[PDB]
Amino acid sequence: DLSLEKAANVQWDEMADITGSSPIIEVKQDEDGSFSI
């Protein structure tokens, strides 16, 4: 038994932090939807 709760509308932020790398990992998914190596 789960309930919902409002959070935000979908809009892009001019005022956003820019972080994160852009690596290239070869990884293969498996039937269930998982990921590894």
Binding site: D32, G33, S34, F35, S36
Partner: protein, 55 residues
């Protein structure tokens, strides 16, 4: 007890938040931990009774 309760609790590579139970061998009982939703290990139980009886 099986060898899969030797393992410590395993939060998967997913970002959901499920409360589950995992057998701390050092502490000697299943405490609740955060399951991410994906590739659960076998030290991962929906209730603490099934974990005590399963370890």
């Amino acid at each position: 007890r099986p060898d899969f309760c030797l393992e410590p609790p395993y939060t998967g590579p997913c970002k959901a938040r499920m409360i589950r139970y995992f057998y701390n061998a050092k502490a000697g009982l299943c405490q609740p931990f955060v399951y991410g939703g994906c590739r659960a290990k076998r030290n991962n139980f929906k209730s603490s009774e099934d974990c005590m009886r399963t370890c």
